[PDB]
Amino acid sequence: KALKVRTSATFRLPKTLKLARAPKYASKAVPHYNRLDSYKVIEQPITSETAMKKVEDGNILVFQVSMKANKYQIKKAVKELYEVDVLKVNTLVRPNGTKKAYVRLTADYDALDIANRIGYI
Amino acid sequence: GAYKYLEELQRKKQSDVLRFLQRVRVWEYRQKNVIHRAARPTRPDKARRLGYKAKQGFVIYRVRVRRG
Amino acid sequence: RPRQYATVSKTHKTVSRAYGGSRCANCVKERIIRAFLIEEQKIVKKVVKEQTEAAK
């Protein structure tokens, strides 16, 4: 019998049956619980007269927050813990090393109502 | 036995057959990498003098080093 | 700028002509003419070689 054909003088690596893993056992044997749940993204509110002017007039909550957290997490955590809906989120890093979050709701809910529901004011 | 024949024949190194064989195998080793695997040895007589038992867990690595 | 050339429409970036927003009209005219003419001249070269080689 005669040989195969070849159009290009390049010889590339062939493709090859790439198995996957389902190997025999597990790497850690225990799925770690949620590193970042609502009860960890939200540490405590903030109650400085500035932020209280905010929550009174601007319909804005002000929270102190983990440095590992982001706005999606914060929004979902608030929607869960406080049974609200949240318009937008502006975060910063307080130079004491912490994170702070200004959290604006819809005009439906009232931040004063839910804050003196929580039990700070 | 054959390893005895092999040992004496490998001692006859300036014989024509072995210096030819040497010429060839050095060409091909030199065309290969500097440290390169061998899955079987070249002198089984010798590897057996030294400890090679042809089973799982023994490995040959052919290696060349500059000279002088 | 070249991403505003994305947000704008096909009408702004092109003309109704072959080789629209890529080549000048006059260059188009030139290469049209050149195409036609040297195709005809290649035909003429072909038939000259034809009749010559057929005679000889």
């Binding site: 159009t7 390049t10 010889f11 | 036995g1 024949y5 092999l6 057959v17 060409w27 079987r40 | -």
Partner: protein
């Protein structure tokens, strides 16, 4: 039909972007390919010494099929039949107490290089087969001279993988027969006479003759041109 036309393109030098051809000849192969190819090439170019190219005079495939049919008759056993053999032997030693001879004597092919060499130096062998494809050739270069000095008939055959297929292994590098049944000893003698005419008798002259010295196609063509032009008369 009237819409189909004949364009035909001119694949010459300045025209008609060239088409797909078979460039099997102009490939950048990898180093392992290049190495084995140039290796065999070099090992024919060089003036090989007679005790090599004592190989490369192999056995024609007809008598090869004959001898391999014979050896397949005198094939060794596998693990399953060995297992049931010795189960029978256990039964017989238990009930009849046959002293390890309830089983018959086996007739089988002898494989193993040092096995075979001692078999030869003791002269228990009837026939020897030797593979040519051996990578350390030193393992086998002596076997012919030894077989001659002993007076044993040997043969060089194609396929150490073939011997392995025969003998249940992957390779064997060697094979030999020492004891055969009378049902086949005569074909054995015939085959041996043929072989001894092919290999054993020509030992002296092949031992004399140097091999190799062969050139490529381009070079042999050039030598032909040069030589006929020089001997032009």
């Amino acid at each position: 039909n009237p819409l189909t036309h004949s364009t035909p393109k001119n694949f010459g030098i300045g025209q008609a972007v060239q088409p797909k051809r078979n460039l099997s000849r102009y490939v950048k192969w990898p180093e392992y390919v290049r190495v084995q190819r140039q290796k065999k090439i070099l090992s024919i170019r060089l003036k090989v010494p007679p005790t090599i190219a004592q190989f490369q005079y192999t056995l024609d495939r007809n008598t090869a099929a004959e001898t391999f049919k014979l050896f397949n008759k005198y094939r060794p056993e596998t693990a399953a039949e060995k297992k049931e053999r010795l189960t029978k032997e256990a039964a017989a030693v238990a009930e009849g107490k046959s002293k390890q001879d309830a089983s018959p004597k086996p007739y089988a092919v002898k494989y193993g290089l040092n096995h075979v060499v001692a078999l030869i130096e003791n002269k228990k062998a009837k026939l020897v087969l030797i593979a040519n494809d051996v990578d350390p050739i030193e393992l086998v270069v002596f076997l012919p001279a030894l077989c001659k000095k002993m007076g044993v008939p040997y043969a060089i055959v194609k396929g150490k993988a073939r011997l392995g297929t025969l003998v249940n292994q992957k390779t064997s590098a060697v094979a030999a027969l020492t004891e055969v049944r009378a049902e086949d000893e005569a074909a054995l003698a015939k085959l041996v006479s043929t072989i001894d005419a092919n290999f054993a008798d020509k030992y002296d002259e092949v031992k004399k003759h140097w091999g190799g010295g062969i050139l490529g196609n381009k070079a042999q063509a050039k030598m032909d041109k040069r030589a006929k032009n020089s001997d032009s008369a």
